[PDB]
Design a protein. Sequence first.
Length: 129
Amino acid sequence: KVFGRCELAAAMKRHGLDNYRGYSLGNWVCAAKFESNFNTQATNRNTDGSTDYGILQINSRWWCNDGRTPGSRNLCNIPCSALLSSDITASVNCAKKIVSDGNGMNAWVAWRNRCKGTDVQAWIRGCRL
Ligand code: NA
Protein backbone atom coordinates (compact mmCIF):
# COMPACT_ATOMS: atom_id res chain seq x y z
CA LYS A 1 0.00 0.00 0.00
CA VAL A 2 1.19 3.49 -0.89
CA PHE A 3 -0.30 5.86 1.69
CA GLY A 4 -1.48 9.38 1.15
CA ARG A 5 0.21 11.97 3.34
CA CYS A 6 -2.84 12.82 5.45
CA GLU A 7 -4.05 9.22 5.44
CA LEU A 8 -0.77 8.15 7.02
CA ALA A 9 -0.85 11.06 9.48
CA ALA A 10 -4.31 10.01 10.65
CA ALA A 11 -3.34 6.35 11.02
CA MET A 12 -0.17 7.27 12.91
CA LYS A 13 -2.15 9.53 15.25
CA ARG A 14 -4.74 6.83 15.88
CA HIS A 15 -1.94 4.41 16.77
CA GLY A 16 -0.51 6.83 19.34
CA LEU A 17 2.60 8.25 17.62
CA ASP A 18 1.65 11.94 18.03
CA ASN A 19 4.14 13.31 20.61
CA TYR A 20 5.30 9.80 21.47
CA ARG A 21 8.54 10.35 23.44
CA GLY A 22 8.13 14.02 22.54
CA TYR A 23 8.19 13.65 18.74
CA SER A 24 5.34 15.55 17.11
CA LEU A 25 3.37 13.85 14.34
CA GLY A 26 5.14 15.76 11.56
CA ASN A 27 8.42 14.07 12.52
CA TRP A 28 6.95 10.63 11.87
CA VAL A 29 5.36 11.61 8.55
CA CYS A 30 8.62 13.23 7.42
CA ALA A 31 10.57 10.10 8.42
CA ALA A 32 8.17 7.85 6.51
CA LYS A 33 8.37 10.07 3.41
CA PHE A 34 12.13 9.90 3.08
CA GLU A 35 12.55 6.33 4.34
CA SER A 36 9.98 4.65 2.08
CA ASN A 37 8.08 7.29 0.07
CA PHE A 38 5.01 6.15 2.06
CA ASN A 39 5.20 2.64 0.55
CA THR A 40 4.58 -0.24 2.96
CA GLN A 41 6.30 -2.69 0.58
CA ALA A 42 9.66 -0.87 0.51
CA THR A 43 12.80 -2.93 1.14
CA ASN A 44 16.47 -2.00 1.03
CA ARG A 45 19.58 -4.05 1.75
CA ASN A 46 22.35 -2.77 4.01
CA THR A 47 26.08 -3.26 3.53
CA ASP A 48 26.34 -5.75 6.41
CA GLY A 49 23.73 -8.04 4.82
CA SER A 50 20.75 -6.94 6.91
CA THR A 51 17.62 -5.53 5.26
CA ASP A 52 15.28 -2.63 6.09
CA TYR A 53 11.54 -3.26 5.80
CA GLY A 54 8.38 -1.24 5.40
CA ILE A 55 7.19 2.29 5.75
CA LEU A 56 9.76 3.10 8.47
CA GLN A 57 12.54 0.87 7.06
CA ILE A 58 13.05 -1.20 10.20
CA ASN A 59 16.30 -3.20 10.20
CA SER A 60 16.61 -6.99 10.50
CA ARG A 61 19.96 -6.57 12.29
CA TRP A 62 18.12 -5.83 15.56
CA TRP A 63 14.35 -5.67 15.21
CA CYS A 64 12.84 -8.49 13.14
CA ASN A 65 13.55 -11.99 11.81
CA ASP A 66 13.86 -12.42 8.03
CA GLY A 67 15.68 -15.79 8.07
CA ARG A 68 18.68 -14.37 6.19
CA THR A 69 20.49 -12.19 8.79
CA PRO A 70 22.58 -14.65 10.82
CA GLY A 71 23.72 -13.58 14.25
CA SER A 72 21.08 -10.84 14.50
CA ARG A 73 18.40 -10.05 17.08
CA ASN A 74 14.60 -9.94 16.82
CA LEU A 75 13.72 -7.37 19.48
CA CYS A 76 10.21 -6.70 18.13
CA ASN A 77 9.47 -10.46 18.05
CA ILE A 78 8.06 -10.39 14.51
CA PRO A 79 8.89 -11.74 11.09
CA CYS A 80 10.16 -8.89 8.96
CA SER A 81 7.48 -9.58 6.34
CA ALA A 82 4.88 -8.42 8.88
CA LEU A 83 6.32 -4.92 8.44
CA LEU A 84 5.29 -4.88 4.76
CA SER A 85 1.56 -5.19 5.48
CA SER A 86 -1.04 -2.61 4.48
CA ASP A 87 -1.93 -2.62 8.22
CA ILE A 88 0.80 -0.49 9.80
CA THR A 89 0.18 -1.70 13.37
CA ALA A 90 3.29 -3.89 13.53
CA SER A 91 5.49 -1.12 12.10
CA VAL A 92 4.16 1.45 14.58
CA ASN A 93 4.47 -0.84 17.61
CA CYS A 94 8.04 -1.75 16.65
CA ALA A 95 8.90 1.92 15.98
CA LYS A 96 7.75 2.73 19.52
CA LYS A 97 10.35 0.31 20.88
CA ILE A 98 13.09 1.72 18.63
CA VAL A 99 12.50 5.36 19.55
CA SER A 100 12.57 4.38 23.23
CA ASP A 101 16.02 2.73 23.04
CA GLY A 102 18.03 5.84 24.00
CA ASN A 103 18.77 7.46 20.62
CA GLY A 104 15.29 8.78 19.85
CA MET A 105 14.50 9.29 16.19
CA ASN A 106 18.23 9.60 15.42
CA ALA A 107 17.91 5.84 14.82
CA TRP A 108 16.43 6.76 11.41
CA VAL A 109 19.22 8.15 9.23
CA ALA A 110 16.73 9.80 6.87
CA TRP A 111 15.08 11.63 9.76
CA ARG A 112 18.38 13.00 11.07
CA ASN A 113 19.53 14.09 7.62
CA ARG A 114 16.29 15.35 6.07
CA CYS A 115 13.81 16.09 8.88
CA LYS A 116 15.72 17.08 12.02
CA GLY A 117 15.95 20.85 12.30
CA THR A 118 13.36 21.59 9.62
CA ASP A 119 9.73 22.72 9.91
CA VAL A 120 8.33 19.20 10.28
CA GLN A 121 4.81 20.47 11.02
CA ALA A 122 4.59 21.33 7.31
CA TRP A 123 4.11 17.60 6.64
CA ILE A 124 0.67 17.60 8.28
CA ARG A 125 -0.52 20.99 7.04
CA GLY A 126 -3.96 20.77 5.46
CA CYS A 127 -4.87 17.46 7.10
CA ARG A 128 -8.04 16.98 9.15
CA LEU A 129 -6.53 15.58 12.33
NA1 NA B 1 16.99 -10.22 12.98
